[PDB]
Amino acid sequence: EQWVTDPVHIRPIAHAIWDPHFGQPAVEAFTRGGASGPVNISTSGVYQWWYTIGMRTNQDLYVGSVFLALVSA
Amino acid sequence: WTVPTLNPDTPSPIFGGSTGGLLRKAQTEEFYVITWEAKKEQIFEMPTGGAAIMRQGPNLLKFGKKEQCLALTTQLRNKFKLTPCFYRVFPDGKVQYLHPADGVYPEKVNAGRVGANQNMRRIGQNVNPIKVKFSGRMMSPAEI
Amino acid sequence: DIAGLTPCSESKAYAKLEKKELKTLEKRLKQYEADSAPAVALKATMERTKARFANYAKAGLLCGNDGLPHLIADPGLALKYGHAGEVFIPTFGFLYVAGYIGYVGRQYLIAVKGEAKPTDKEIIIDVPLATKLAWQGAGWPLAAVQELQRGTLLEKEENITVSPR
Amino acid sequence: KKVKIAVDRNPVETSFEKWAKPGHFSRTLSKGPNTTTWIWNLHADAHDFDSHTSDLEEISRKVFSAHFGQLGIIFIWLSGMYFHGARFSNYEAWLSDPTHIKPSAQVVWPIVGQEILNGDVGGGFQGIQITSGFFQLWRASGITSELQLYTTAIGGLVMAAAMFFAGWFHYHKAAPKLEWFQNVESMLNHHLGGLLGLGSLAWAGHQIHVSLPVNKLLDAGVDPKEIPLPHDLLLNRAIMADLYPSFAKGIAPFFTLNWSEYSDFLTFKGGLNPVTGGLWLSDTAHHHVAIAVLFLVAGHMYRTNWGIGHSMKEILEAHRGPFTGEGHVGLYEILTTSWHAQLAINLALFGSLSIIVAHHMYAMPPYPYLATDYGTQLSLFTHHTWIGGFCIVGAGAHAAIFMVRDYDPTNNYNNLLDRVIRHRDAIISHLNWVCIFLGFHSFGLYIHNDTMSALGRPQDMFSDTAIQLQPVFAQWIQNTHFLAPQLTAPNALAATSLTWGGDLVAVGGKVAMMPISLGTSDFMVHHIHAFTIHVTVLILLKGVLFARSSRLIPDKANLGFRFPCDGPGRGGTCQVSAWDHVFLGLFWMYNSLSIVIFHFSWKMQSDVWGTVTASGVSHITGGNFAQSANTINGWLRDFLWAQSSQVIQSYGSALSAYGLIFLGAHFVWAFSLMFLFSGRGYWQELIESIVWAHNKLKVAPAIQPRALSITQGRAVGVAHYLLGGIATTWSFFLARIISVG
Amino acid sequence: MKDFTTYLSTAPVIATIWFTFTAGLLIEINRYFPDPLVF
Amino acid sequence: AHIVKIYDTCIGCTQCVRACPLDVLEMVPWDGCKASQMASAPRTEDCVGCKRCETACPTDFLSVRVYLGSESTRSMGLSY
Amino acid sequence: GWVTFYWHWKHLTLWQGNVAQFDESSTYLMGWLRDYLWLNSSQLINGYNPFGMNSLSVWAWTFLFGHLIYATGFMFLISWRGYWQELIETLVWAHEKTPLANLVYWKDKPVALSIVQARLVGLAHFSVGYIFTYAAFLIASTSGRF
Ligand code: CLA
Ligand code: CLA
Ligand code: CLA
Ligand code: CLA
Ligand code: CLA
Ligand code: CLA
Ligand code: CLA
Numbered sequence A: 001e002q003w004v005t006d007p008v009h010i011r012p013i014a015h016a017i018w019d020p021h022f023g024q025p026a027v028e029a030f031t032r033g034g035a036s037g038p039v040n041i042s043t044s045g046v047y048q049w050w051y052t053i054g055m056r057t058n059q060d061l062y063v064g065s066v067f068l069a070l071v072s073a
Numbered sequence B: 001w002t003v004p005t006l007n008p009d010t011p012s013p014i015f016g017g018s019t020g021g022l023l024r025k026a027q028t029e030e031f032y033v034i035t036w037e038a039k040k041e042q043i044f045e046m047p048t049g050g051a052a053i054m055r056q057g058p059n060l061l062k063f064g065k066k067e068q069c070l071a072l073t074t075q076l077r078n079k080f081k082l083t084p085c086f087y088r089v090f091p092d093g094k095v096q097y098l099h100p101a102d103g104v105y106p107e108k109v110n111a112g113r114v115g116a117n118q119n120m121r122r123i124g125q126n127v128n129p130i131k132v133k134f135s136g137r138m139m140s141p142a143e144i
Numbered sequence C: 001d002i003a004g005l006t007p008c009s010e011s012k013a014y015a016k017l018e019k020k021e022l023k024t025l026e027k028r029l030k031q032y033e034a035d036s037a038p039a040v041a042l043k044a045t046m047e048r049t050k051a052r053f054a055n056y057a058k059a060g061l062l063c064g065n066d067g068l069p070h071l072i073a074d075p076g077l078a079l080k081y082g083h084a085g086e087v088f089i090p091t092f093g094f095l096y097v098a099g100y101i102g103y104v105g106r107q108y109l110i111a112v113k114g115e116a117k118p119t120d121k122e123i124i125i126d127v128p129l130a131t132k133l134a135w136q137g138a139g140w141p142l143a144a145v146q147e148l149q150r151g152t153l154l155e156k157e158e159n160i161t162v163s164p165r
Numbered sequence D: 001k002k003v004k005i006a007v008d009r010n011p012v013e014t015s016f017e018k019w020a021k022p023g024h025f026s027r028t029l030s031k032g033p034n035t036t037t038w039i040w041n042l043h044a045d046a047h048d049f050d051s052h053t054s055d056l057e058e059i060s061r062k063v064f065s066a067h068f069g070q071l072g073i074i075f076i077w078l079s080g081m082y083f084h085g086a087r088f089s090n091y092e093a094w095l096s097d098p099t100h101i102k103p104s105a106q107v108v109w110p111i112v113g114q115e116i117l118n119g120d121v122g123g124g125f126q127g128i129q130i131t132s133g134f135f136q137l138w139r140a141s142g143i144t145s146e147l148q149l150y151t152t153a154i155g156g157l158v159m160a161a162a163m164f165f166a167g168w169f170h171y172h173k174a175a176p177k178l179e180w181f182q183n184v185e186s187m188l189n190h191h192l193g194g195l196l197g198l199g200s201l202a203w204a205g206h207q208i209h210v211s212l213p214v215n216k217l218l219d220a221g222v223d224p225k226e227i228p229l230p231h232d233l234l235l236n237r238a239i240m241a242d243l244y245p246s247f248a249k250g251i252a253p254f255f256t257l258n259w260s261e262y263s264d265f266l267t268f269k270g271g272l273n274p275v276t277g278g279l280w281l282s283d284t285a286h287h288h289v290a291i292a293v294l295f296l297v298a299g300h301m302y303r304t305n306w307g308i309g310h311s312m313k314e315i316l317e318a319h320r321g322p323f324t325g326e327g328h329v330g331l332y333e334i335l336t337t338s339w340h341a342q343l344a345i346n347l348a349l350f351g352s353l354s355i356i357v358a359h360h361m362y363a364m365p366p367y368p369y370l371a372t373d374y375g376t377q378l379s380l381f382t383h384h385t386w387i388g389g390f391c392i393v394g395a396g397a398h399a400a401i402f403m404v405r406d407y408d409p410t411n412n413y414n415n416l417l418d419r420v421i422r423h424r425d426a427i428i429s430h431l432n433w434v435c436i437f438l439g440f441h442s443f444g445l446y447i448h449n450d451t452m453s454a455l456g457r458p459q460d461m462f463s464d465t466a467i468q469l470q471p472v473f474a475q476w477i478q479n480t481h482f483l484a485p486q487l488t489a490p491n492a493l494a495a496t497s498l499t500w501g502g503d504l505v506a507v508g509g510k511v512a513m514m515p516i517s518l519g520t521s522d523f524m525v526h527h528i529h530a531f532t533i534h535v536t537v538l539i540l541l542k543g544v545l546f547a548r549s550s551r552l553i554p555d556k557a558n559l560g561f562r563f564p565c566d567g568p569g570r571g572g573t574c575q576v577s578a579w580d581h582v583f584l585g586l587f588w589m590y591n592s593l594s595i596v597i598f599h600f601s602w603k604m605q606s607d608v609w610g611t612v613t614a615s616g617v618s619h620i621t622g623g624n625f626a627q628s629a630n631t632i633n634g635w636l637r638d639f640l641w642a643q644s645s646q647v648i649q650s651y652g653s654a655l656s657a658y659g660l661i662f663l664g665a666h667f668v669w670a671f672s673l674m675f676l677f678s679g680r681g682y683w684q685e686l687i688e689s690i691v692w693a694h695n696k697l698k699v700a701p702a703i704q705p706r707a708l709s710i711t712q713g714r715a716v717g718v719a720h721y722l723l724g725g726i727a728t729t730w731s732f733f734l735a736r737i738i739s740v741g
Numbered sequence E: 001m002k003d004f005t006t007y008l009s010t011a012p013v014i015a016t017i018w019f020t021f022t023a024g025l026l027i028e029i030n031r032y033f034p035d036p037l038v039f
Numbered sequence F: 001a002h003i004v005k006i007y008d009t010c011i012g013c014t015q016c017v018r019a020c021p022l023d024v025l026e027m028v029p030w031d032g033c034k035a036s037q038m039a040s041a042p043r044t045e046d047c048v049g050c051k052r053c054e055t056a057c058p059t060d061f062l063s064v065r066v067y068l069g070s071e072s073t074r075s076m077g078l079s080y
Numbered sequence G: 001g002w003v004t005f006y007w008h009w010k011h012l013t014l015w016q017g018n019v020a021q022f023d024e025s026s027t028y029l030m031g032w033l034r035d036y037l038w039l040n041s042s043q044l045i046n047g048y049n050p051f052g053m054n055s056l057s058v059w060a061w062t063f064l065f066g067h068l069i070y071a072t073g074f075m076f077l078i079s080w081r082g083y084w085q086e087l088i089e090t091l092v093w094a095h096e097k098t099p100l101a102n103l104v105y106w107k108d109k110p111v112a113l114s115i116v117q118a119r120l121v122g123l124a125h126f127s128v129g130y131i132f133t134y135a136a137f138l139i140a141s142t143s144g145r146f
């Protein structure tokens, strides 16, 4: 939702990081991209693809995820 | 000629022991026993490592696999010109004579032997694997 | 000219590179005497560098944005803009020497194959026969064309071993 | 029982007839080639003298003549080094300024632009900076002019001619008998007394009469031209008396047991010379005197032709305990009849000695202006270490060869060898467990440190600031050696080396030698070294003990020492021969020695080598070993990535050749991976297709092209792997140490 | 002398002499004609 | 167990039987060659698959072939 | 590897605004090793150092991870079955003769990996290490530079 507003200066986020082995410096080191915790910066390009095909909000991605899960089942 | 019978009360060659002997397989699956006759006391090399002394007369030894027994047989035949023979012993006490199976060594032809696994054709006459496909299991064209 | 390149005689980077090489050589020479062995060797290297740059510019080579000569491999462009000396003439020169070597070796193998022990001649080279064949190999293209036209260059398919497929 | 000279006259006729018949030494190769394999076999069995014939006398004669040929080659190489130092070097200029002029003894011809390799080494000379250390050795011997080096080169050529003549004379004219070679008592007596003792005594005489006065005047600031010639010093007693007052009394104090008078040139100074940075030559001269006396005494122990002396057979038979059965019975016959067993023992001790030489040479620099020449020190340590490791692997190989060919069970009924082979399973199993324990407790520390450092937890690492592993035993030993000259060495003026502790010695603004402190990183790298050495020992020992038989193949001895496998049966019996164990041991030796030289280079450049400034010493890398050697990332970044800058940007300078080799060595090593990961079946079929193309054009050779054998493929792969890796490290080390050191 | 010439006619000796001759010819050509890049 | 097969190109040289390290092959009477003998494999349950018999065969192509089949304690040559 | 190296170096010089660097250093292998591999891995190997760490430390750990997997693959690629089978036999004897441990026995007899299995395992480690090493280097260099 924030990357669509400024897709030139905002890095995409893959997913959050939950690792009990991380120390404090690793926690603030991976905390970037505007998130509230340690996350991974995606390099797959799904943000640009979804933005080009029409995705704008998180609701759209949620609905698409549920639909693909039903298709998988 | 008649099939010999194993004599468990047979003296063994003078050996101090080693760590390459029998294992749990001898007590749970099977083991092998080789016996031979020596004309004199002589030092030979054990297939499991070390040097043993065969005594004058009967000699009995135990091995974990048939290859060790045949290696010792080859050593005794080629060096000391002896005639050894071995058996496969099971934990229940069953003894099965193995070599020489018919009393004559397999390198020399003997009457009464029935040929087994002989193909009356050459290798180039084997069929293609496609003709053997979809069989009961993985089968090679040479098996037919 | 070709591919947007410029001749080395007019490239500024070419002259700049020549000045840079002469500058580092002169800088190394500044620490020695004027009539010693390192001074003479450095002066000889400087003269060789100047002669090499002048000869490359005189040859008409094309230099890129880096100031280094670029070769033209297309026969049409090379023959149309005077660049046949880069890749064309050396191509035929290599073809002549390579075919020379191959023809001499083939002739030696065919000559020693009809003897009692050809393998012995293969490990212990018969110098007189090899020298005679090496001298006679000057006419390798004509001899090769004649062998190909007579059908004696190749071996029949029935005389060559193959796998059982 | 009688030790005499037993020689046969004219056994082999000198002729060129066999020179035209390749493979004459082998019965199988004398028939001639039919396939290309024969050619390789011709070189793989050239020196396998025991394989050509079973006569021990013929093998011994061939070995003795081959030794003469080797000595002739060595003499030619030494003569070449002296000639290069006398005609294409700057030794004379380097003598007047050894702290600024770089040693050089190789000049290249001005062809194809290679003249750039003739760098400005100083002294008005252009050439390649050498790292062999011949300049320091020649300076230590008292050589001051090129005429002396030229004369030594001519003498070396004469000695080489004499060695080759001796080999020919002993193989074709006067060949010794088998009983002559079996005189181990006489041979040991002569080698201990004559060779070693007399060589040490002669070198002590040269040091006392040439090295000591010439080097004393050199250190005093006298020009080499003004220093008297060695014969002038050896001709009159006035000059020597002025330089050493004890020379005024002649050799009289030596015979009157007044040795204390010779304390001016025979001392126990210890430490290093503050002018040159090397060991005191008076200490080296006194050392050689003591060594000569000790070896001369040791050379009168064995019985030869009189009642006095010892019989090694009796000594070996008298050592028998209740835990080892018979003992050393049959060992005398084994070592007096098998050349492979002797080669195994000699190669093992020889390699160990070479490694000891490398350590003692860097720690106690014996040559003047050697410690400050960081390039020479690093190159010498690395070279001697590699030679030692190679000789050790060869020792394992020949031990396995003896066990396969010369072992006889009728002479080893209950000896030490018999019992070792009897419990080889227990030996190998325990060594396997200790190898796994060492690997975990050595490499896991680095992995744990890497993980903790990456996870942002430096407080949980195995470092000096965090949980530390201090080598208390090594530190205690260092303190003991440093405090030794005051309690346990009253006559020693200083310690043996400065690595134990104390003040630093600097020559020309560069630290010649300073104390070496050991911390957690040193502890970890030492355990890494122990683990790698244990794995190499495990592979070599497994290949020696299981060379004749094993639980997988009971008749391995019948298959020989060098065979590819025993088929794909029993699940697969690939690389079961002892040769393959040596093949794998070579890789492990390379790994071990590579980590050893890497540790030496980083430790020396970080805590020892460096410049001297006002109130402080600045090292080459700034002391980053204690903080970065505890992680693999530190070794990859601070040691491999940071120090490789000098070799990758060396283009356009005199060290550019090193950079070229640095790339070439990466090629050969990668080339090895083609032979090590592939099999000859694929290559044979590919050759079949190429042969088809050749038959089509009537260019098929009579000698059938065959792919390399399985053993040859493994040998080629390991040879290329070792060459590429060692050459890579050589180029990197030399370029870095010459540019920054 | 015949055996010596036969030994000199072997593959390694012949290869050594031939490669030394070829290398010497190329080196002398590059010495008298320095830095040849194009024809 | 492995599959060992004998073909009619066998010359009865008995080299494969002498090279077998586990006594798998033997010689039986035959009439298709001068030696009047033929190789046989009546104890294939003890074959390990070392292929020494194929190495010892002089016919072109080989008269004895070993095809690696199912693996057991005997075929794997395990003494434990 | 060659095609991806070429793509990454040409695009790195393009994005950095200096295509002349690639044009003048891609003609010799030393330029490829120094100006592309050594120069672009400085930020990668500095993901975690004795002074701390940053968000790029995961790629440094993955870089060393791939190097380790690749080297582990070389073991299955160089050493072959026989040596390992003999070693495993010695281990079998050691387990059978050890008290307090021989009471626990295996259900499957321990044997060395087959020749085909060894090749597959070595190739799998080689490929995994290759892929992980290049992926970590490419992502770290491209993300750190831009
Ligand atoms: C190995 C592959 C190869 C390749 C990829 C090329 C590629 C090329 N060649 Mg070429 N050529 C080759 C082999 C090759 N050549 C060989 C072996 C010969 C010796 C017989 C020639 C001799 C040759 C000549 C004489 C000419 C080219 C030319 C050309 C260029 C344009 C013509 C074309 O594409 O048609 C393929 C090329 C041919 C079929 C050869 C005949 C030339 C055709 C008929 C085009 C010529 C018409 C005209 C000059 C086109 C340019 C118009 C204008 C810009 C002047 C082109 C880049 C032309 C050029 O650009 O001149 C500078 C040119 O005139 N080549
Ligand atoms: C010119 C004098 C001469 C002549 C005519 C002969 C002739 C003969 N010698 Mg003899 N020999 C000589 C000198 C000579 N030798 C010397 C000086 C030595 C001491 C090293 C020996 C020691 C010796 C031994 C131990 C043996 C012979 C044997 C033989 C016989 C056959 C082997 C042979 O020559 O093949 C030719 C072999 C070669 C040409 C190899 C030469 C290798 C040299 C010595 C080393 C070269 C080192 C090289 C430069 C470094 C490698 C680096 C690489 C990059 C080049 C043959 C009749 C053998 C024999 O009788 O068989 C039963 C035997 O075993 N010789
Ligand atoms: C004091 C007596 C003496 C001395 C000095 C030597 C010295 C040597 N021996 Mg020898 N040896 C001796 C007695 C001696 N031996 C006796 C009595 C026997 C019989 C039991 C042997 C049997 C023997 C064998 C079987 C071998 C040696 C070998 C060697 C060489 C080892 C190579 C080396 O690393 O050294 C360093 C190298 C040098 C110091 C080079 C200098 C060489 C000069 C010429 C000194 C040699 C002196 C020696 C006595 C020859 C003089 C005799 C005269 C007729 C010329 C070495 C030069 C090996 C060999 O053959 O090498 C060729 C070897 O295989 N020796
Ligand atoms: C192998 C080692 C070695 C050698 C060769 C020498 C040699 C020498 N030392 Mg020396 N030295 C040594 C070790 C050695 N040393 C050691 C280890 C020490 C420490 C203890 C010393 C300490 C020392 C001192 C303090 C002095 C010497 C001195 C000398 C010189 C005279 C010796 C002497 O006084 O009369 C010794 C007499 C003989 C050795 C007999 C000579 C035998 C001749 C050559 C026989 C020739 C016969 C022949 C048939 C002649 C015919 C010729 C023909 C053409 C017709 C002499 C050249 C003195 C010196 O140089 O003065 C400055 C002296 O002061 N040395
Ligand atoms: C005093 C040292 C010494 C001696 C006398 C021997 C002697 C012998 N060794 Mg041995 N060995 C040694 C050390 C030694 N070795 C060391 C240090 C190693 C560890 C590497 C080995 C490992 C070893 C093995 C594995 C084997 C032997 C074998 C043999 C025997 C056959 C001769 C031979 O190898 O064929 C001829 C020799 C050659 C063909 C030399 C090969 C040339 C190499 C590959 C070149 C090395 C690269 C070079 C340094 C760089 C040049 C650059 C290049 C571009 C030109 C022979 C009795 C073999 C054997 O016993 O047969 C059953 C056997 O297979 N050795
Ligand atoms: C970097 C690659 C690599 C690695 C990791 C190994 C590892 C090993 N080699 Mg080896 N080797 C290699 C390359 C490698 N080799 C190559 C290229 C060759 C060909 C020349 C050989 C040839 C060779 C031989 C001939 C032998 C070995 C042996 C050994 C073992 C020694 C025992 C030990 O070190 O204890 C500990 C193990 C290690 C240090 C490996 C790393 C383990 C990590 C640090 C622990 C991680 C645990 C972690 C919590 C796991 C959780 C995973 C999670 C998903 C659940 C060991 C497992 C010897 C042996 O059999 O053992 C006695 C042996 O004889 N190797
Ligand atoms: C093999 C080397 C090695 C060693 C010595 C250590 C050691 C340690 N690690 Mg570590 N680690 C390693 C490898 C190693 N690691 C590797 C390879 C990785 C990457 C996979 C990691 C990843 C890692 C993480 C993520 C963490 C650690 C942590 C720790 C610390 C606590 C672990 C713990 O409490 O477990 C418990 C240990 C045991 C239950 C067994 C103890 C072993 C006993 C003493 C052996 C008994 C033998 C005995 C003498 C036999 C007696 C015989 C007879 C007399 C009865 C500890 C000091 C933690 C830490 O951060 O430190 C603060 C932590 O979180 N490590």
Ligand SMILES: CCCCCCCCCCCCO[C@@H]1O[C@H](CO)[C@@H](O[C@H]2O[C@H](CO)[C@@H](O)[C@H](O)[C@H]2O)[C@H](O)[C@H]1O
Pocket: D234, D235, D236, D237, D238
């Ligand atoms: C161990 C024997 C084998 C090694 C042989 C070594 C001998 C070498 C030959 C050269 C000999 C040089 O030996 C030299 O002898 C002369 C004898 O005048 C001594 O000369 C000195 O003492 C003599 C008196 O004794 C004085 O007259 C003379 O003016 C003074 O120089 C030298 O101090 C010694 O160096």
Ligand SMILES: CC1=C(C/C=C(\C)CCC[C@H](C)CCC[C@H](C)CCCC(C)C)C(=O)c2ccccc2C1=O
Pocket: D674, D675, D676, D678, D679, D680, D683, D706, D707, D708, D709, D710, D712, D713, D714, E015
């Ligand atoms: C490449 C390769 C080969 C093929 C290697 C070969 C055929 C060796 C090639 C060496 C030279 C090139 C053969 C010809 C030597 C001639 C004497 C050269 C004459 C040429 C003149 C210029 C002198 C194997 O045979 C092999 C076997 C087992 C495991 C791996 C491999 C393997 O990787």
